[PDB]
Design a protein around this ligand. Structure first.
Ligand SMILES: CN[C@@H]1CCc2c(ccc(O)c2O)[C@H]1O
Lengths: 288, 333, 233, 54
């Protein structure tokens, strides 16, 4: 009803405010202090920048679209907003994958890790991640390689008052793979190996100091790291692949709901990747 | 031993009788300097590991710093440039000095050898001029009397005066029970004082070679030492939070600088050009500025991620540079 | 004028040299060979070699750098060894009945307690080498001074349920070795908070595989530090 | 033995000295600080034009 629209608007405003505040706080904390300038913190700030871009561009305009039920802006603006959304999502997820791989190299090969990760190498990795994200988003959308040959889709592409997402099978499959499924399997293997390392270290410590008093923590941390990423994004890409195949019809409302559930991962990310005592001290110093 | 106890009792009685009124009473009417706001004008970057010691050049522009990476870097403070970067034979370095003539730089540490580098050589950019050896402990601090003499303070509980050209100890000073951790020369260079781990600061006469006065003060070790600009008083830093000022003529403590919140140690002490401010580093990550005549804190210097290990005030009193364990040199004003 | 250009060129050259030096420095680890006198530190140092004493050895294409310092009970220079990979502690485990006045083993335990509780040496793991195992075995096996005479707690001591012995050993020598190890381990366990651990090893002059033990201990140290940094341990 | 005699002689050397009253010393330090406070860039804020680092 009328109250429902106001409630949805309030929820969207709270979500965008939380995302913007958290990401800008993380970026300011990393930039202001030279202590926080660390090789892994470059990946962290790349993730924060991607999440801030998404929460500033895709979230507000998408909320305006869902509340207004039509696209007031031009046809070029629809394509640009879609490109920015896809670019931000891909960059964020691939940066999560890169952080996972960095941790894999940190624990798995501690001696060689300090030598083959450097500031220049980190910058090259971040630039490569953003270029890969851009090619998946801007190149197909801007040159209209994602447009599908459907009657409803063709009608939607004509009228400038409607800005929805209708995509061909090939582009949707490739984008879903590159954005989520390759990072998913890479992060799964990485975190499985890291959990194995932590477990074997725990048994080694227990063997060394069994008589004296001195994997709950590892399991809890890996759950808080992987579950919040899997639970947020997995349903969206699952239903993406499902409706693209069209074998099981998916309503547009369900698609939008799962997409926004994926969107809130940008807000959830700083609460997972910025719990370090140095980051907490920096946040306390910055705010009161 | 009985005579020594009587002599010590007589010295203590004479010091107590000489104490008419404490410095706090006399400086009561002096207007406080008020709060002092100071910010990092320039940050010097390039050091690999923690920085221990630094020394401002006589030109008030060039400063030399030492780190555990084995690099002895000479910075141009005005332009934030690296004039020189001297490698070192031993990675572990705990001291450095810059000659008054601006031509020589001294270094030392756990290597038990005082290394002196000639910056005026043209065939080679930097090279070892002398390998001053003879100490049996780590060199805590080295200072330059002139271009041809140097005084060092080692862990052998002895301070020695060296001759650069000949290359051996001209005179040695003994009397400290514990390791000597700091050394500062009087402006006239005829006298100097060296703090020791024995909770005692001693005054030495360079020409005579014999100790003159000894001040007890606190009970913890002394890590920092610095004369008053007048050359007639000095202030000490301790592992205990107390920072104390002594007087040569009164031969006893005048005022003590301590605070209830501070429980950490002091690693570096220096005076302002006019002597009104006593800048003292701390084992805590931040530095402090004390009013010398009133023992009231004026300003707090913060912005170092680790403990402050070096500190100095330039000759013209324009800037203060503190080198912490964060491998960064910050120049304040 | 040209002074600014000359300074810029000098800074650029020095910065390139410092970048190369930083790569070389971060590629190499540092250890402190700190132990009591006449405890076999020279023998173990010579085994690993294959005012201060610095020896550099590499294993598995990983560069290790060791420093042995040589002068009183007070140690203010110990703050210079913060942020080292590990501290190697060699002790004459056979010297449970000797004068160093005071028992040598007790003096070594006091030194270990001082090092473990040092503020600056926090988050620094200690690799423990119980040197001179053969002499300890010869002493305990033969009829001689009992451990309980010098260490009262040995009478109530019992063999731990782990009971991991060598291929061939006696119950008495195993009890003595494990009691000596557990004294150090009990000193190490209480004060630690998971940042730094103590790695004990029973070594002798005949053994020459201590390079592998040091390499494995350093690998475990860095792995545990990385795991605790990310809060997975 | 011999160290005790050296320590006693050293204490005797330090004992024989003239000490001026703490009032005079405090007055001297205060006078020096008051006289030289006019040329202390740290104590008083130097103008940005005359500041070399700024
Ligand atoms: C307009 N919403 C888009 C539609 C499809 C899509 C998204 C995000 C990442 C991708 O790889 C996609 O293919 C969604 O944000």
């Amino acid at each position: 009803d009328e109250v429902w629209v106001v409630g949805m608007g309030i929820v969207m405003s709270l979500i965008v405010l939380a995302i913007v505040f958290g990401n800008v706080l993380v970026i300011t904390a990393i930039a202001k202090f030279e202590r926080l300038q660390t090789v892994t913190n470059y990946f962290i700030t790349s993730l924060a920048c991607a999440d801030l871009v998404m929460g500033l561009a895709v979230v507000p305009f998408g909320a305006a679209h869902i509340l207004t039920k039509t696209w007031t802006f031009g046809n070029f603006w629809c394509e640009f907003w879609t490109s920015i959304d896809v670019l931000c999502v891909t960059a964020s997820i691939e940066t999560l994958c890169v952080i996972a791989v960095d941790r894999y190299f940190a624990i798995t090969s501690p001696f060689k890790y300090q030598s083959l990760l450097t500031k220049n190498k980190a910058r090259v990795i971040i630039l490569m991640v953003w270029i890969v994200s851009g090619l998946t988003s801007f190149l197909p959308i801007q040159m209209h390689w994602y447009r599908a040959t459907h009657q409803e889709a063709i009608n939607c592409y004509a009228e400038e008052t409607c800005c929805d997402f209708f995509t061909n099978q090939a582009y949707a499959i490739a984008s879903s793979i590159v954005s989520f499924y390759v990072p998913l399997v890479i992060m799964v293997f990485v975190y499985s190996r890291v959990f194995q390392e932590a477990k074997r270290q725990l048994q080694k410590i227990d063997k060394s100091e069994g008589r004296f008093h001195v994997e709950h923590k590892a399991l809890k941390t890996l759950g808080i790291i992987m579950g919040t990423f899997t639970l947020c994004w997995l349903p969206f890409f699952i239903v993406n692949i499902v409706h693209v195949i069209q074998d099981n019809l998916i309503r547009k409302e369900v698609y939008i709901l799962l997409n926004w559930i994926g969107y809130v991962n940008s807000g959830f990310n700083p609460l997972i990747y910025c719990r370090s005592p140095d980051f907490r001290i920096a946040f306390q110093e910055l705010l009161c | 031993r009985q005579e020594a106890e009587q002599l010590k009792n007589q010295i203590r009685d004479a010091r107590k009788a000489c104490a008419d009124a404490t410095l706090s009473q006399i400086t009561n009417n002096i207007d406080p300097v008020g709060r002092i706001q100071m910010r990092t004008r320039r940050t010097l970057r390039g050091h690999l590991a923690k920085i221990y010691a630094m020394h401002w050049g006589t030109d008030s522009r060039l400063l030399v710093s030492a780190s555990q990476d084995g690099k002895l870097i000479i910075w141009d403070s005005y332009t934030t440039n690296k004039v020189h970067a001297i490698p070192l034979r031993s990675s572990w370095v705990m001291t450095c000095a810059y000659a008054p003539s601006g031509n020589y730089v001294a270094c030392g540490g756990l290597d038990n050898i005082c290394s002196i580098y000639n910056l005026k050589t043209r065939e080679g950019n930097v090279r070892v001029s002398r390998e001053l050896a003879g100490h049996t402990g780590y060199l805590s601090c080295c200072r330059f009397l002139d271009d041809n003499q140097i005084v060092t303070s080692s862990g052998d509980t002895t301070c020695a005066l060296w001759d650069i050209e000949t290359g051996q100890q001209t005179t040695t000073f003994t009397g400290h029970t514990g390791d000597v951790m700091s050394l500062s020369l009087a402006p006239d260079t005829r006298l100097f004082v060296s703090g020791a781990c024995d909770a005692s600061a001693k005054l030495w006469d360079v020409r005579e070679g014999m100790c003159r006065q000894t001040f007890t003060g606190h009970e913890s070790d002394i890590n920092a030492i610095c004369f008053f600009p007048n050359g007639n008083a000095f202030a000490t830093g301790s592992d205990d939070a107390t920072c104390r000022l002594f007087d040569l003529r009164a031969d006893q403590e005048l005022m003590t600088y301590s605070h209830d919140n501070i429980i950490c140690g002091i690693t570096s002490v220096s005076f302002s050009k006019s002597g009104r401010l006593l800048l003292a580093g701390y084992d805590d990550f931040n530095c402090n500025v004390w009013d010398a005549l009133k023992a009231d804190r004026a300003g707090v210097l913060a912005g170092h991620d680790n403990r402050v290990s070096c500190l100095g005030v330039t000759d013209d009193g324009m800037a203060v540079a503190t080198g912490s364990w964060d491998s960064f040199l910050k120049i304040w004003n | 004028r040209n002074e600014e250009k000359a300074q810029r060129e000098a800074n650029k050259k020095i910065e390139k040299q410092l970048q190369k030096d930083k790569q070389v420095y971060r590629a190499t680890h540092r250890l402190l060979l700190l132990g009591a006198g006449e405890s076999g530190k020279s023998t173990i140092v010579k085994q690993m070699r294959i005012g201060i004493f610095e020896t550099k050895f590499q294993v598995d294409k990983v560069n290790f750098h060791m420093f042995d310092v040589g002068r009183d009970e007070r140690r203010k220079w110990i703050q210079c060894f913060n942020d080292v990979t590990a501290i190697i502690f060699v002790v004459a485990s056979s010297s449970y009945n000797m004068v160093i006045q005071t028992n040598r083993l007790q003096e070594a335990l006091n030194l270990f307690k001082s090092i473990w509780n040092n503020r600056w040496l926090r988050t620094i793991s200690v690799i423990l080498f119980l040197n001179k195992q053969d002499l300890l075995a010869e002493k305990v096996l033969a009829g001689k001074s009992k451990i309980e005479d010098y260490f009262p707690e040995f009478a109530r001591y019992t063999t731990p349920e782990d009971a991991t012995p060598e291929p061939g050993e006696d119950p008495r020598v195993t009890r003595a070795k494990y009691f000596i190890r557990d004294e150090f381990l009990r000193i190490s366990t209480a004060s630690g908070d998971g940042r730094h651990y103590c790695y004990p090893h029973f070594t002798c002059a005949v053994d020459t595989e201590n390079i592998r033990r040091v390499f494995n201990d350093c690998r475990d140290i860095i792995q545990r530090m990385h795991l605790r940094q990310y809060e997975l341990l | 033995i011999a160290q005790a005699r050296k320590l006693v002689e050293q204490l005797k050397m330090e004992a024989n000295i003239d000490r001026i009253k703490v009032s005079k010393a405090a007055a001297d330090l205060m006078a020096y600080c008051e006289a030289h406070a006019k040329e202390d860039p740290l104590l008083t804020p130097v103008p940005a034009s005359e500041n070399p680092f700024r």
